[PDB]
Design an enzyme around this catalytic site. Sequence first.
Site, short mmCIF file in Angstrom:
data_model
loop_
_atom_site.label_atom_id
_atom_site.label_comp_id
_atom_site.label_asym_id
_atom_site.label_seq_id
_atom_site.Cartn_x
_atom_site.Cartn_y
_atom_site.Cartn_z
N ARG A 162 38.21 33.55 -60.13
CA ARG A 162 37.40 32.76 -61.06
C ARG A 162 37.60 31.27 -60.83
O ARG A 162 38.72 30.75 -60.90
CB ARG A 162 37.66 33.08 -62.53
CG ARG A 162 36.69 32.32 -63.43
CD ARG A 162 36.47 32.93 -64.79
NE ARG A 162 37.61 32.72 -65.67
CZ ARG A 162 37.62 33.06 -66.95
NH1 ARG A 162 36.55 33.62 -67.51
NH2 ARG A 162 38.69 32.84 -67.69
N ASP A 443 43.58 32.04 -74.14
CA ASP A 443 43.13 31.02 -73.19
C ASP A 443 42.33 29.95 -73.93
O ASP A 443 42.22 29.98 -75.16
CB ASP A 443 42.37 31.63 -71.99
CG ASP A 443 41.04 32.26 -72.36
OD1 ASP A 443 40.37 31.84 -73.32
OD2 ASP A 443 40.67 33.21 -71.64
MG LIG Z 1 35.27 32.28 -71.21
#
Ligand SMILES: [Mg+2]
Length: 529
Positions: A162, A443
């Site tokens: 990512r 996150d």
């Molecule tokens: Mg996201």
Amino acid sequence: ATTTDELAFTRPYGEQEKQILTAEAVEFLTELVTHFTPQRNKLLAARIQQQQDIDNGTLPDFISETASIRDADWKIRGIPADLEDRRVEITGPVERKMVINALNANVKVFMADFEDSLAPDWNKVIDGQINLRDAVNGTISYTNEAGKIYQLKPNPAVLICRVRGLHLPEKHVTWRGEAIPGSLFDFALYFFHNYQALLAKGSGPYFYLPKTQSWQEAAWWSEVFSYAEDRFNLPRGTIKATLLIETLPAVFQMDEILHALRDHIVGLNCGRWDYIFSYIKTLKNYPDRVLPDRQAVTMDKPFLNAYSRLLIKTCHKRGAFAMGGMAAFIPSKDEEHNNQVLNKVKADKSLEANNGHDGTWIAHPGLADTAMAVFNDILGSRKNQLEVMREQDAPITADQLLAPCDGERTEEGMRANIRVAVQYIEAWISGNGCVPIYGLMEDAATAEISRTSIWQWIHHQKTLSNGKPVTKALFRQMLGEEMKVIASELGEERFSQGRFDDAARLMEQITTSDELIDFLTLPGYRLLA
Ligand SMILES: [Mg+2]
Ligand SMILES: [Mg+2]
Ligand SMILES: [Mg+2]
């Protein structure tokens, strides 16, 4: 100013930079930057104009002119053999031990993350590239202080990288005096260093693309990928991308995104936190679009269930995967203490599988066998649910996708948002973007929804359910009070030695500003070297 087509590097090269930023790697990166940065900057400018149009009172909807794409039969170019079964994926940072543990987990795929779970310190981004190259080559290993060695088991999970989103700068590399796109830095280096070994072993260069807002952004990615393929004489569609639908604008353009990236795309993903963060940002000036406690804005609410079902239907129409969301729980090492969490995981994953999702996400290896069991049971002998077309669903409309859900705006919820966001930010500015907080692996999106919800309540002068008007002053009072709660929970040593003063200041800055800033990572990045 000069017409330079060269990059400048702000950091002196050590051993790690000499490994990753080789002459050839930098030549390739340079080509991508000069060829694609101007268009990237125009895409960011287009976002500003599209948002102005929404602010000015025209709600988003499907695109009329591209009706012919949506109502034609066609499919994506294809899915490689090792991406036909993705029933569970684990996500995590690119730190060396974490990469090994993730690849060894009982999952199909590991998404190694340079985006929301990474605080993008230069050393961590470079170390991340070193780690992923060692992982692709099968040699990655780590020995801890206690002398325990960690190595890859036979047949590790498939690796997908990512990249940072289109808005993020990589400030340590510049072109014409301006930071290059982090998106291009992360893509270029993972691709360049690994495409040959990935392809030789029966895999390929695979990416996860975050925070897309438009089909034109998807088209830009397809140009970047095609340039990279052509440069190294790869067939079209060798690079494969999975694209998160985690912004409100993108939910109206899923089919156009699939079409624009049809050579390279293999799936779309649903999520929760980035999507509702984006809902609020996008509808920030609408007094009738105020969401209640984000804790109560669950995937079963009508607007989010409509999002799920539309994504699944659209993906499967085109032969693409439709991935479900995240279970971020950190289970106990003692199974006897995990009943409540595992029951929740089972219920949530069953909902996703029953809706037709091809796979789902976890953050911790201790959830793998439970998540895998839910999908194994419902899949039977199937590899995926591509045949689940949802043809019996009525049309899904913009009114349905935009409808704010029921719930309360509560003092308890607001205080919890403050505690979670401040603790996330404190870790992030200390270099850790993947943070255990109250039993969840958090996150950046968790901090984003937390601060953005409070901003929305202040902006529209909303009351809490107990009658208290939400104001900047109320927030500041609560912030001070919750800092004391955090201190009590962590203890004097952890709290005093931590970066909580700086975290509280950033939280205050991003929450009490008159204008809603797009991403907390932009001001946050100033605190990193
Ligand atoms: Mg996201
Ligand atoms: Mg050229
Ligand atoms: Mg093309």
